[PDB]
C-alpha cells in the first residue's frame, strides 16, 4: 500500500477546462448535472450551500443556470481545492 493515495489516487475525473465547462454546459458532451455532481463530490458542504447546489440535482439544474455552475467551477479550481487535486 501507500496511504498518501488518500489525496494522490488515480481516476480523478471531471477536471475539465473552464471553456469546456461554460461553452458545453447543457450539451450531451458536458451536461449541467455532471458539473453539479463533480462539485458536490469534491467540494465541502459549505460550497454547495453557497451555490444552492445542496438540494436535489433536478431542482438544481432547473433553478441554477450555467452562470452559477461556471462561476462555481472557476472559484473552486482558483480556490486550490483540497479534493486531492495536487493537494494533501
Curated annotation (Swiss-Prot):
Name of encoding gene: HECTD1
Subunit structure: Interacts with IGSF1.
Top-level taxon: Eukaryota
Residue ranges crossing the lipid bilayer per the database entry: none
Family according to the record: Belongs to the UPL family. K-HECT subfamily.
Section of the entire sequence shown: 1879 to 1966 of 2610
Protein name as it appears in the record: E3 ubiquitin-protein ligase HECTD1
Protein function: E3 ubiquitin-protein ligase which accepts ubiquitin from an E2 ubiquitin-conjugating enzyme in the form of a thioester and then directly transfers the ubiquitin to targeted substrates. Mediates 'Lys-63'-linked polyubiquitination of HSP90AA1 which leads to its intracellular localization and reduced secretion. Negatively regulating HSP90AA1 secretion in cranial mesenchyme cells may impair their emigration and may be essential for the correct development of the cranial neural folds and neural tube closure.
Amino acid at each position: 500500500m501507500k496511504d498518501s493515495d488518500k489525496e494522490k489516487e488515480n481516476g480523478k475525473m471531471g477536471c475539465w477546462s473552464i471553456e469546456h465547462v461554460e461553452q458545453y454546459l447543457g450539451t450531451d458532451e458536458l451536461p449541467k448535472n455532471d458539473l453539479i455532481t463533480y462539485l458536490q463530490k469534491n467540494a465541502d458542504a459549505a460550497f454547495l450551500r453557497h451555490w444552492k447546489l445542496t438540494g436535489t440535482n433536478k431542482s438544481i439544474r432547473k433553478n441554477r443556470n450555467c452562470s452559477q455552475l461556471i462561476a462555481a467551477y472557476k472559484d473552486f479550481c482558483e480556490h486550490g481545492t483540497k479534493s486531492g487535486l495536487n493537494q494533501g
